[PDB]
Amino acid sequence: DSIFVKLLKISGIILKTGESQNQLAVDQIAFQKKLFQTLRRHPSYPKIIEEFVSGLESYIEDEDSFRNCLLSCERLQSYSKSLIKLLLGIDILQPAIIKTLFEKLPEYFFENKNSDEINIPRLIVSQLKWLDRVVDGKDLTTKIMQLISIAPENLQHDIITSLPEILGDSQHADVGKELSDLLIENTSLTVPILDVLSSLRLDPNFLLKVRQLVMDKLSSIRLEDLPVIIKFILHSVTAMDTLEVISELREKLDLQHCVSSGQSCIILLFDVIKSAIRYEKTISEAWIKAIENTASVSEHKVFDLVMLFIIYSTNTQTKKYIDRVLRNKIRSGCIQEQ
Amino acid sequence: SVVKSFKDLQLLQGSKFLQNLVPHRSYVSTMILEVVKNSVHSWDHVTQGLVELGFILMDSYGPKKVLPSLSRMPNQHACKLGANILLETFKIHEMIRQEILEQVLNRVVTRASSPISHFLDLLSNIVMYAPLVLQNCSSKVTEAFDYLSFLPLQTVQRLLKAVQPLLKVSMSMRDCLILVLRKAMFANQLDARKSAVAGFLLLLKNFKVLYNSVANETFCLEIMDSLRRCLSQQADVRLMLYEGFYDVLRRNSQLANSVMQTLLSQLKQFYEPEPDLLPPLKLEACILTQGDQISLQEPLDYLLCCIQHCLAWYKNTVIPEAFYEDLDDILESITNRMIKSELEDFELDKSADFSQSTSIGIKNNISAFLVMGVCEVLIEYNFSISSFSKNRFEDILSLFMCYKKLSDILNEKAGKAKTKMANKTSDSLLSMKFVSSLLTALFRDSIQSHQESLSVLRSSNEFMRYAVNVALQKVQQLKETGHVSGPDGQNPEKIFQNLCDLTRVLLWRYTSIPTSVEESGKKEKGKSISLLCLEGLQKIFSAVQQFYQPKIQQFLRALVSVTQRTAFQIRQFQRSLLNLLSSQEEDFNSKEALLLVTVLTSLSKLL
Numbered sequence: 001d002s003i004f005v006k007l008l009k010i011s012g013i014i015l016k017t018g019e020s021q022n023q024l025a026v027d028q029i030a031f032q033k034k035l036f037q038t039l040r041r042h043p044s045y046p047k048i049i050e051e052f053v054s055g056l057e058s059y060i061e062d063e064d065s066f067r068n069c070l071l072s073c074e075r076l077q078s079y080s081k082s083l084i085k086l087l088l089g090i091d092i093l094q095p096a097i098i099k100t101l102f103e104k105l106p107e108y109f110f111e112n113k114n115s116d117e118i119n120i121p122r123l124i125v126s127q128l129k130w131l132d133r134v135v136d137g138k139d140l141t142t143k144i145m146q147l148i149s150i151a152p153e154n155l156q157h158d159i160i161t162s163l164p165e166i167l168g169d170s171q172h173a174d175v176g177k178e179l180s181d182l183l184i185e186n187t188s189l190t191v192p193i194l195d196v197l198s199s200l201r202l203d204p205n206f207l208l209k210v211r212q213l214v215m216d217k218l219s220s221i222r223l224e225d226l227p228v229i230i231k232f233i234l235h236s237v238t239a240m241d242t243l244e245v246i247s248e249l250r251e252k253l254d255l256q257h258c259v260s261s262g263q264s265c266i267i268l269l270f271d272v273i274k275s276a277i278r279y280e281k282t283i284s285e286a287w288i289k290a291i292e293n294t295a296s297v298s299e300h301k302v303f304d305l306v307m308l309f310i311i312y313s314t315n316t317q318t319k320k321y322i323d324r325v326l327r328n329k330i331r332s333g334c335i336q337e338q
Numbered sequence: 339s340v341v342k343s344f345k346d347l348q349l350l351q352g353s354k355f356l357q358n359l360v361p362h363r364s365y366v367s368t369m370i371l372e373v374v375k376n377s378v379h380s381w382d383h384v385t386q387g388l389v390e391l392g393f394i395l396m397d398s399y400g401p402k403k404v405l406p407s408l409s410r411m412p413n414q415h416a417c418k419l420g421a422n423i424l425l426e427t428f429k430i431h432e433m434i435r436q437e438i439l440e441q442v443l444n445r446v447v448t449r450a451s452s453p454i455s456h457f458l459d460l461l462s463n464i465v466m467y468a469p470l471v472l473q474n475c476s477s478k479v480t481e482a483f484d485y486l487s488f489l490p491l492q493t494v495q496r497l498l499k500a501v502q503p504l505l506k507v508s509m510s511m512r513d514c515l516i517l518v519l520r521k522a523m524f525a526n527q528l529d530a531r532k533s534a535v536a537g538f539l540l541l542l543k544n545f546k547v548l549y550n551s552v553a554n555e556t557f558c559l560e561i562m563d564s565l566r567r568c569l570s571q572q573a574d575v576r577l578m579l580y581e582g583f584y585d586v587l588r589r590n591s592q593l594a595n596s597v598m599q600t601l602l603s604q605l606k607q608f609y610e611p612e613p614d615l616l617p618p619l620k621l622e623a624c625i626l627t628q629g630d631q632i633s634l635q636e637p638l639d640y641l642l643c644c645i646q647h648c649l650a651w652y653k654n655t656v657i658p659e660a661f662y663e664d665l666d667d668i669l670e671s672i673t674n675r676m677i678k679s680e681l682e683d684f685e686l687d688k689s690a691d692f693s694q695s696t697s698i699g700i701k702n703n704i705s706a707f708l709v710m711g712v713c714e715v716l717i718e719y720n721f722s723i724s725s726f727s728k729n730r731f732e733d734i735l736s737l738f739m740c741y742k743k744l745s746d747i748l749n750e751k752a753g754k755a756k757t758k759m760a761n762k763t764s765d766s767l768l769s770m771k772f773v774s775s776l777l778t779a780l781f782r783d784s785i786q787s788h789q790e791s792l793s794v795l796r797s798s799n800e801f802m803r804y805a806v807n808v809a810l811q812k813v814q815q816l817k818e819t820g821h822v823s824g825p826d827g828q829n830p831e832k833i834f835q836n837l838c839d840l841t842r843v844l845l846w847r848y849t850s851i852p853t854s855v856e857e858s859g860k861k862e863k864g865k866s867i868s869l870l871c872l873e874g875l876q877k878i879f880s881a882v883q884q885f886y887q888p889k890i891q892q893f894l895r896a897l898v899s900v901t902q903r904t905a906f907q908i909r910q911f912q913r914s915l916l917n918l919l920s921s922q923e924e925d926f927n928s929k930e931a932l933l934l935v936t937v938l939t940s941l942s943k944l945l
Contacts, residue, residue, distance in 0.1 A: 027595070071552065072555065072556050078591075079555045079559075080596075116550075129560060130560065130564060130566075165564075195521070198525065200524070235484065278440070279444060279448060279481075279485055
């Protein structure tokens with residue numbers, strides 16, 4: 001009886017009551033153009049949109065109805081998209097459905113895997129990925145920033161990495177700024193933010209600043225995220241900066257704050273560093289230079305010797321060179337038996 | 339000790355005089371491969387030096403000369419002993435797996451400038467043998483997925499092909515490659531996006547499943563949406579997508595509409611859907627210029643080719659709904675108007691001389707190649723439509739006459755400069771399947787329902803010589819690289835069947851109709867059809883010895899041991915040479931004789 005269900009029925013989608021998927025009578029483009037010309041030529045042009053979305057929100061109050069609207073439709077006539085993505089394909093509907101998608105998203109913060117083990121808010125943000133047309137880029141950005149601020153930790157971990165799918169190729173600067181400003185506060189979310197910052201289109205001197213910023217706070221990271229961050233740092237070296245970053249890393253990595261609780265994480269970390277030096281030869285040389293040039297500091301750590309034996313056992317050019325260096329550390333009293 | 343042995347063995351096999359005298363000695367090759375059998379029990383001391391010998395033989399004797407007998411064949415034979423050592427050592431010694439398979443990878447990833455085919459072969463062999471015994475050494479693979487962005491593309495495709503058998507069985511390794519490809523989808527380098535596209539096409543191409551079986555379908559749809567967005571990037575990524583979409587269809591039928599609309603919408607940016615508008619493709623949008631740097635985007639030719647292949651497959655397979663008829667009538671409108679276009683709709687030959695000095699000549703040259711590709715695709719379409727209608731063959735002739743006018747244009751303009759550009763000898767957009775069928779229908783076919791209609795094609799000699807030229811181009815592509823350019827141009831079995839079919843047809847035209855029927859013109863005596871058929875025969879016989887060595891029985895059976903079949907074929911060829919000789923011709927085409935002794939030199943290695 002609502003305008004929404006009537007227009008969808010004459011458009012050619014059978015609305016299921018909410019267990020199995022919604023059926024399709026026509027094709028996707030046919031339905032989209034059908035509803036477009038239907039809403040175009042219909043009288044009362046600037047109010048049928050608000051009536052449509054009011055009927056929509058009143059319909060998707062129910063969990064099953066909304067869950068089926070989010071899930072992909074069924075071809076009766078061989079398998080296509082969801083009603084929400086098809087509806088967001090139409091530019092004149094887009095921002096209203098965006099708004100009523102984000103207004104009801106704080107309803108599903110604490111809702112997690114009730115019946116079908118389908119986590120809802122990831123299904124909500126699924127329908128914004130790879131949009132053909134974006135109207136309101138700034139508004140969409142500010143809305144996801146409000147959500148990414150206010151969200152639970154798991155939800156903001158999820159949506160933050162699905163950012164590059166969502167945004168076009170314009171509005172990346174302020175997004176980078178807000179995410180880095182989130183990074184200085186929250187250290188639990190270091191791993192996906194860095195993941196993303198290379199996966200946007202940022203200026204390189206923003207990335208180097210965030211890299212310096214995370215190496216500054218490298219001690220304040222939980223143990224599980226540590227090999228991932230070191231993986232990021234080592235994967236993001238050039239030929240020119242390598243020694244400064246490696247030497248910061250040599251001076252800042254301790255193994256007296258993380259020591260089946262700590263041993264597994266250290267195993268993983270050494271696996272990362274082994275696999276870095278194996279697949280990239282300049283990190284070995286960089287790292288012998290970072291220990292050999294430490295002459296004054298008779299604060300040599302454990303990390304210096306375990307690194308010397310790993311670069312010995314792997315790439316086997318270094319052997320004469322680590323014999324020489326390690327001789328010159330024992331005469332000098334710098335490395336000792338304890 | 340291993341390179342010397344193979345020198346010695348080549349001397350004996352090349353000469354009977356030494357075979358009579360020397361009684362058959364065991365060679366170092368067989369001894370090493372005996373050592374490896376013996377080593378299973380307890381000899382672990384010995385096995386860590388077999389691996390080092392393996393990789394010394396492969397690292398030292400592997401190719402470089404492609405990036406002679408003595409520099410090649412006792413180095414080719416050492417490098418394949420190396421790989422045999424490491425594969426046999428890898429099968430039975432369960433502890434030098436994560437040291438061979440991390441040392442093969444560390445050579446594949448990191449060198450990438452020097453040729454590393456030999457390691458990819460070994461890595462394919464290692465996987466193919468038992469990916470069941472590589473789920474105990476898997477993390478060494480998924481650490482090389484993180485280096486995948488920075489590799490050249492051919493290495494990525496080869497290395498992704500080679501691990502396919504690991505991707506069949508392991509779902510963790512598939513879901514570890516997806517995260518890397520998705521992350522490199524957006525990365526700022528160019529080659530990372532190509533490697534993502536490649537990986538995504540190969541995951542769509544080889545797999546259905548990537549837990550409810552709705553999310554697999556929506557995931558395929560989302561991948562296809564990311565690739566649909568990649569369609570608006572640069573030219574090469576578009577071209578990769580257009581080649582890939584056919585193989586994506588032919589495996590996963592369910593993605594039919596998601597592909598075809600993806601092309602049709604992409605066609606409609608460059609198509610004008612009104613009759614009596616004479617350039618029926620918008621060629622301006624296909625070239626972009628930003629301050630005198632001038633480059634291509636959207637090759638229309640490959641797009642239409644992908645459309646026509648997918649559409650033909652849609653007709654022949656899917657129907658035995660009211661969408662494909664639209665694209666049919668679009669293509670028919672393009673043919674109908676491309677016929678009654680002439681040369682000033684694309685401003686060709688009169689106003690611009692396609693000069694490689696200015697931006698405008700660049701634009702016009704790209705335009706000309708695009709129109710040439712379109713005409714070739716529409717030749718293949720118009721052939722494919724009907725059971726040999728006269729009117730459609732007149733349209734084929736008219737399209738070919740347009741293409742041939744453009745070719746003689748481009749040849750005269752490559753006559754002022756040189757033919758240094760390999761862009762007209764750049765591939766034809768005819769499938770090899772189609773050229774086989776076309777030459778079978780041109781020469782051999784004598785069914786009266788087709789004769790009246792084919793007689794307009796046969797009467798065009800330039801068409802038939804173009805057709806055999808195209809078959810020669812496909813065999814030269816098979817020789818130079820491993821495989822050919824078009825559809826089904828990467829499955830060796832399809833190239834084998836089409837090689838057999840070309841052999842049959844060209845033999846029938848060589849032997850049945852002689853050479854001394856030349857009533858055309860004296861420029862065609864080094865370009866005659868019975869000569870080009872023999873040239874194609876020479877290339878086929880070379881290529882089938884090289885690449886299809888294990889099939890020469892079932893190559894010849896399509897034309898009792900191999901000796902009798904080869905003897906009968908030699909009887910044909912040597913009879914040909916005999917009547918060529920005793921004719922006592924003073925002009926004496928020595929080219930045909932050279933090719934005849936070349937094919938006989940090729941054949942006599944099978945007796």
